[PDB]
Symmetry: C3
Subunit: 318 residues, 3 copies
């Protein structure tokens, strides 16, 4: 039995493509609560947060898009996550764009000083506000959280409340295939361990999971924050997303990551972001992405491919 | 072509069962595999073919449901009694018996008939374990229960169903290996674990890789001694993207390459003695190409089990023509 | 920095399915030049070559279709390829059917007698004009180039210029899944090493690339000719091709082949053949194939999935 909290974060200001705000609804309609209930999860539904809108939040330094709104929505989310984690719940957040991990990791770190992060994504999301080319904050969340990058990060409007809470040795990336040159330098320079699609092609998903846990929890037990962007999966499996990159995780690899995260017993928070149902060419393609999102969450809380979750005690006798 | 690396004597039996489940159209499965060019493909591999044709199945008039759950028990048990005779005949005559399905309840018949080869072993390729007892099942569909009737160790948990008195448990727990499991019922999981039935789920394939899965499968089954092999292949073991024309599809299945690899490894043992190719249902496909792709894939599995390979080399070439 | 010459060879006469001539255009329209420019490549586009047409071209031995048209266009291509290799450039030939490899490998071997070939295809393309059943020359290019096969190859009209240059030990195949009985006989009896889809299933693409280079460049460094048939990829990824065969390379395996070729620093010439935009059922299937062809060429010239192709060594400070 797991105590699990669920938070809806209908936020899109971390990027330019509209519809990602409908992400939490699409995941709920796909039957998330029912699936978590069937696994025996003691649930708490915090509903879908209404983020305080910012009227004056124009382009900053001809680069950064909506900084005030992103910083604000994330401060609000950080409080709700803090509450869920302090109440003793494993915190599930439904996105919304990936800028929301600023809020979810900040909130979770308020209670876990030794938290580690498993970041499952096609992208590194580690551009600083000076290295970014798009200026979209969904490509920058990790720069505000990493301690080693504080001196390389300018203070943005609405971002005063963030305190870096994770060290470079405490985050492992899985699924990378679209990394900006400044992001590649950051990962290499600061010894941030990653397993790109190329690493998985060579090692395979089993050794990748073994080496991830070896790096993070090999010396001691630690709470795990799984930050999962749906674009980590191939766009054939997850088409309803803003930044799709071909050559992604298969359905089996993705279930494997979630299953292995469940088996540690250390899962403490999970973000499931970037599901944009409006970006799918048909209704069933939007529905496939949403159902895939539920499978990741369910497998992260016990759903297995061997049917061993619901325990059978005795076979009836004739 | 006149030369081949091997010459196989293959018996083909069409078993269009449907009473082992409730989805209509699986009875058109043997016809779909035939239409996709099965006989021609086996001949192109230098097989000596004995086509036993498509078997006729007549349902029992007063076939009442056992414990108000188990649908068509007598019709399923009797059809399997008849199927078991044809399979025993084909194997006794020296043929590798290929049975086209039809739903997976037909394996009660093919395995029972085959065993009449007592030291046989079963390789069960499926998304499902089909090991529910008549008491543990929730659907009542007998295609989800065939292994329960065949296992010696399960006999005490299996009630004597009407039309099933003829069946004698022929295979022990240690003589059946599953491959592709991804939709296991909680009572099935209990049986597999408590009876020590070895399986390789989609998760084990994810970890080990299909090569290690086949090596370990043969170590467990034919490692101690050379034994005839019964390959019972449910098409739902493949991903619905590759095999959509099926009754119970489950996402995250075998890739085309994995399925061909299993079949080629089965051929390389030189021990295939009977093969079931079940659960092709052309009606359940949204399009003709989807139904044809499933039927074509079924032909590829059967052909690879009798020598067809990715590299070629099944057909022996003499010399190159000189100018 | 890589000097790269792009030769559009709009061939079609090596087979019967019309539309493959519009392949170089489809690859260019998929942003090939923009992509290679962003890799820091010094580019020369020869555009689409206009091959001299042969109006009177009768079938040889009532089987071999269009032999003079194929033999001449390949002689014209070998001159251009020899000039590009001469001018310092790494030669990229856009197809067009695979018979154009007769020209590209011919031209290239004039300046690189020690070249080795990595043939990436669903097929072995090694039928002699006496073993072929189709009569399509795109299924025979390797017979004419292979030294050890000279006594089994008859002199075709407009094929006298061809000097067999590659030895059996200097060609390795990758991706083989549809091999004719005479083609299998040639491979085994002449000791031509290959990695079928089955060898890939067992070894994995990493070990395949390792063994490929051990056979070819294990004794010394040599120039590499990468002849890449788009049909080596599963038809789900590469549908707009003439001869599709199920159970091919995934996108990831294909990128890995290309990345490993790049990592040698020995790529001297590359063929990207058999993209036929006409054979796609929809506009997205034609663009998917063309985008895939651009990804292969780009990865063979440095494009990575980790992002370390561009030099970056200083982070901006606020
Ligand atoms: C340059 C683009 C056309 C390119 N193909 C891309 O995917 N760009 C988005 C990246 C961020 C993706 C945020 B995520 O989805 O992971 O949450 C980028 N590195 C950034 O900084 O804008
Ligand atoms: C006969 C077909 C159904 C069959 N499955 C096939 O693909 N046939 C083409 C082969 C040639 C492939 C040239 B390539 O695209 O690689 O460049 C063949 N071996 C030949 O010689 O015609
Ligand atoms: Mn992201
Ligand atoms: Mn992403
Ligand atoms: Mn079955
Ligand atoms: Mn099944
Ligand atoms: Mn080919
Ligand atoms: Mn080819």
């Amino acid at each position: 039995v797991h105590s699990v909290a669920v938070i809806g974060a209908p936020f899109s200001q971390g990027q330019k493509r509209k519809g990602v705000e409908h992400g939490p609804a699409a995941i709920r309609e796909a039957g998330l609560m029912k699936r978590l209930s069937s696994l025996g999860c003691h649930l708490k539904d915090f509903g879908d947060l209404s983020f305080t809108p910012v009227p004056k939040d124009d382009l900053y330094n001809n680069l950064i898009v909506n900084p005030r709104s992103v910083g604000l929505a994330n401060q609000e989310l950080a409080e709700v996550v803090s509450r869920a984690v302090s109440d003793g719940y494993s915190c599930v957040t439904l996105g919304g764009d990936h800028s929301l991990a600023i809020g979810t990791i900040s909130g979770h770190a308020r209670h876990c000083p030794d938290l580690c992060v498993v970041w499952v994504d096609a992208h590194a999301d580690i551009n600083t506000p000076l290295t970014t080319s798009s200026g979209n904050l969904h490509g920058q969340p990790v720069s505000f959280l990493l301690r080693e990058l504080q001196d390389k990060v300018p203070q943005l409007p609405g971002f005063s409340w963030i305190k870096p809470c994770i060290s470079s040795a405490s985050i492992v990336y899985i699924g990378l295939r679209d990394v900006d040159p400044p992001e590649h330098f950051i990962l290499k320079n600061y010894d941030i361990q990653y397993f790109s699609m190329r690493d998985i092609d060579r090692l395979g998903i089993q050794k990748v999971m073994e080496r991830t846990f070896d790096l993070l929890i090999g010396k001691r037990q630690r709470p795990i924050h799984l930050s999962f962007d749906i674009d980590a999966f191939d766009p054939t499996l997850a088409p309803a997303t803003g930044t799709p990159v071909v050559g992604g995780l298969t359905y089996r690899e993705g279930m494997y990551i979630a299953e292995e995260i469940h088996n540690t017993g250390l899962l403490s928070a999970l973000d499931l972001v970037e599901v944009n149902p409006q970006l799918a060419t048909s209704e069933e393609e939007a529905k496939t992405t949403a159902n895939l999102a539920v499978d990741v969450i369910a497998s992260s809380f016990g759903q297995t491919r061997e049917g061993g979750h619901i325990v059978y005690d005795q076979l009836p006798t004739p």
